[PDB]
Symmetry: D2
Subunit: 387 residues, 4 copies
């Protein structure tokens, strides 16, 4: 009963299953796949949509007559299969021009190029029916602070993003922009390192309401931060516009592992959080197969992402309805009305009452929260030892 359905909204980028297995110390181990071919494969596999960079579909320097031929051949396949393209993004990292930043390059010709490349990807996405536009600032960072550029980048990236959002307004595009933070790699440090950094940033834009987040499991986990907490903050802010799902061992290079493969328990509580929050956006698997795999292994990878998500979704439902879990949580969240009356909106009469209330301090200093028992129960559900 773990078969992917379109209402699950699983998506894959062309670059994900299409990854040829090249790394900084190794040749490609797989053959480049045709975009129309991976659209048919994903459809066969049960995916809802495919995402793309501009350069995933249209190589740099393609004459704008060959470009339109590529786009129409690609749209035919989407028509045939019923796959959606929910999300696009410009590649602002491969081109050598972007060696010291795209939006944060000190050279205004390069910031102009980055902006242009972005407008063009917006136009492409509009053709394909994309509704989300992701910005990953892979190149926006530093390893040499002596420049003093950290003081300049906030205004530069504000300027780009305001221009992009006004352009969409002007064109009648219905894009929501989803910003994707990452702490490092390829840059020594990337300026917009965390979900919080991007959240803070959005509040400074002209049209904040068009902007939200694309958190990736692996990005937060690289820095050893807690992804569930970061996503809960994004949700609390009403800014979870997209989410990238994969796995990652902490404190190293981005591994882009199959979802749920390393950090089961964290995966478990992420799915629980998304599902019980009424998140309605794509579940994107921004990951790729292990370099030890041939093409059959690529489709095993893809199947396993979705399958693991669905096993965890079901398990999370069963966990939440366990009677002992409900009993532990009800005691956990026990709320005295007498206590509640001292809290809430400021009074002065509350401030005065609070300062002279008889607080049951000794009882609270001795309270055990029974979290060791609750955690063991969660582990036993995960292990399938409990029903």
């Amino acid at each position: 009963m773990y078969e992917p359905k379109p209402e699950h909204r699983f998506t894959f980028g062309l670059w994900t299953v299409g990854n040829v297995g090249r790394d900084p110390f190794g040749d490609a181990v797989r053959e480049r796949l045709d975009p129309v071919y991976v659209v048919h494969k994903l459809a066969e596999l049960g995916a809802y949509g495919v995402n793309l960079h501009d350069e995933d579909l249209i190589p740099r320097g393609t004459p704008p007559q060959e470009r339109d031929q590529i786009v129409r051949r690609f749209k035919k396949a989407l028509d045939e299969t019923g796959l959606k393209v929910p999300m696009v993004t410009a590649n602002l990292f491969s081109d050598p021009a972007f060696k010291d930043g795209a939006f944060t390059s000190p050279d205004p010709w390069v910031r102009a190029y980055a902006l242009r490349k972005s407008l063009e990807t917006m136009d492409l996405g509009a053709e394909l029916g994309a509704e989300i536009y992701v910005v990953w600032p892979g190149r926006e960072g530093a390893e040499v602070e002596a420049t003093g550029k950290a003081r300049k980048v906030w205004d530069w990236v504000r300027e780009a993003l305001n221009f992009m959002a006004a352009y969409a307004e002007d064109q009648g595009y219905g894009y929501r922009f989803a910003l994707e933070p990452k702490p490092n790699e390829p840059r020594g440090d990337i300026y917009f390192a965390t979900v919080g950094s991007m959240l803070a940033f959005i509040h400074t834009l002209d049209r904040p309401e068009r902007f939200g987040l694309n958190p990736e499991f692996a990005h937060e986990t690289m820095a050893g931060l807690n992804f569930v907490h970061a996503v809960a903050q994004a949700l609390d802010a009403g800014k979870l516009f997209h989410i990238d799902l994969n796995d990652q061992r902490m404190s190293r290079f981005d591994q882009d592992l199959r979802f749920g493969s390393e950090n089961l328990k964290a995966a478990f509580f992420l799915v629980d959080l998304l599902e019980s929050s009424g998140y309605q956006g794509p579940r994107h698997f921004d990951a790729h197969a292990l370099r030890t795999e041939d093409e059959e292994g690529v489709w095993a990878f893809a199947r396993g992402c979705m399958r693991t998500y669905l096993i965890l979704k079901e398990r999370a439902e069963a966990f939440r309805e366990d009677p002992e879990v409900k009993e532990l949580l009800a005691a956990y969240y026990q709320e005295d009305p007498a206590a509640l009356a001292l809290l809430g909106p400021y009074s002065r009469e509350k401030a005065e009452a609070l300062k002279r209330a008889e607080l049951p301090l000794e009882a609270k200093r001795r309270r055990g929260y029974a979290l060791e028992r609750l955690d063991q129960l969660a582990v036993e559900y995960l292990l399938g030892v409990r029903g």
Copy 2:
């Protein structure tokens, strides 16, 4: 020429030089010092002020007749020495009642206690002339996500902080609140993990303008994040209300090392950033002497913190006026007016011109930014090999 002056605004918490050298695996190695005694020592050392938790000065359960006797004796010493108390904060981490959070405890009696203790510390600080109030959420985190509490904490800490700021308005206190993020420890993860997380949070409060940041060097560095980038974002937002200065080796327990002792270069660029930004707040050394030290080593620690800051400030000035550095940076930031005309506020006529401009891509793909030479120059300034 590295003697601390009051205009430097160096401060020390009572808990910093007063640390008795106890750790999780070891007995105290030093004697507890008297508050009036450390006020006289700091004054002698050249410090501008002293900070304190409520429990640094007044132990829990002190009857409110002995309390006032303590406060007046302490105020006498400040009068005598001329030391300021720029900052206070409630201790919301020691008391066992706070074992599963203070503001984020599921039990409303404990959230009430935490709020009360904070109002009391605000009152105390007003007596002493404090102008900044710091909140370090050391207990606001989790190691058991099965509770689902991550969804609830944002509202809870909003409620507390809105109540505190309204209370200050009502009392006529002139506090600016400075929020202090830390990624983990003592909790497995702390919810408000990063400078960005706190920044995002402040925009959701009722009176955002009363709220700002207290970044600590060691906190961001624990998670392997870049402190200079985080502070530059705080500064950009106009929310650097206070700053905690120390050092730290990445990816372990908070070491609270003497400032500038491990990460010279990052210390260098932090001092340069504060000094050239016109930051006017305290430079707090939230650190303590090595456990291998007697009381003499404590004052060696204190002296070194201020001395290192002043050596780095001078060196940063000399670096910025080096003629080769100015020449490298002028070429680094070279700005074509033709390029600039394609950038800025959205036009449509700009969007059109941009899309068909003749961009010098080939020249930019080949540009070298000479950052290896600039970085080597920075290192040779640091080493004092250049003038």
Copy 3:
């Protein structure tokens, strides 16, 4: 069917369930428990043995007439319950004298004290029937390299350990010594940071055969290293003398979490590795309950450690006998005899044949190892979705 039995050889140190919940930012949250009381509790819980530091049983400065009264009252409880004391270790970290190392203190009075304290714990253990002696070098590290001490510590710790082993020979004690590495904490860095560092060290001792390893899951994981690889190297060398089981999120303070509570998959493969290696030593849970717990939570903690280990042991057996897993592994380890003949002990005639053999390079460059499918299968076993 997950009830602990004595043949499981589960052990707990007195310091583990007896931890009072004090941390660097917080008061104790639990009451100190009586050693005889925790011996009866552990016995009731199904544990095989209890471990102890000298100071867990006998506080520093206890007169050697009260000491013997403590030992005999403790031995009575062991007699009554049938619990063993498999392992003892001197506390070389709490005493302030140890502030700059025990065995690596520059002061020879302190190295003498450390050695004496160790001989005394050896004598104590011999009374109690202990067979393993653990050295955790918690204090043997540095944060100030300017001393040049890193050049000296290898000889100093060699001298101590050679003395201890000769002493045991001379006394007729049957101890095996198990060295416990940790990368940092309470020291900035601990000299003997890794399983490999200890292994290398043992080969330099006079009686290497008396010396082995006590790896702890959390220690390797703190530094982000792979515990299963480190234990496999220990096992290969025949040096796994003891093992400490718990859990840990990477790159922070030692959390000493309940076993299997964070990293299920790594726990799964650790149990599989121990069980299929014929490891016969204790399975020690060097961990403690969450600070949110009362005493009932402590025993939930203890029960969960053993229960999780037994669930994972059973699941590992079922995984290894899955027919599809056997089929994938048989293909994974396919061995050509023609290939095998080029390998093995050096020949010269092999060297010549190898240099001119016709290697099937193209087939191997295209081989897929089906590790994505195998990994997904392992995950589905863990989740209990497969039989």
Copy 4:
């Protein structure tokens, strides 16, 4: 006075200055350089030698008639310039055949290929006069533990290395083999993760005396481990055969930064350690220029590596002869003869004397080691504020 001389023994791999600036998210930013050209550049720069992989000089599949033409053209340049080739190593990571290990591939055809490729690089280096052979196990690792391969790899890599050393004996090659550990990347975890892991390994080989270490600053630092401690253990064991010098920010992808550029203080004490140990091997800068650099930036990078090493060498000399430093260290290492008599080789009469000696515990519990003062002095020397 910081000009490189041949007695400094600075070396660079062809792959270091020859790096074209390609990374996992980006195209090459530089042109491929000719081996003969970089030999003349390095010679002009003051380098002592150049190192190489087999594939740096001879691309895979080069016919053994063109190969000999390449080697002789290369040797001509070495003759002309006087550069040495101190070290060679086979590339066992780029070829797709090596996707699941070279020496640790489960397929014996691939282990055979790996061994052959190594014998061939040994022959090549013998032509060029190489004296050190480095093994970097870049591909020897895992991300899927379900295979159980961690149990098998120790014997496989023993077999390869034993064959290699016997082959060299048989051929009359004078190679010392230098094993280069790395914790992760490109593999999730690399089996031979640490200096210690390699040291332990060497003791299990047939001819241990031919085998030593090639520690790299960045590798240990990636995992957050202390490189000075690891090198001190290598030196203690007499196994420092080669050393790779660069820099690195902890807990991320290998950055291969210019030496001394990030971690000044650690670089300082590393140079002090090498210089004062009488290390006579190459000082290899296994690093490359920032991707923001053109070819001029590459030679700035190269010059900076050597210049920084020489500034730090001079400074370390001056630090060690500072009179206050000598005074602090003399007190730090104060040794009581009465204490010394209780230590050393085991006696029984010593054991008995020790157990009843009158130890000055109270004085030692109160001793301050003045390490905060010493550390500040080290920092002020580094900053060039002291003479």
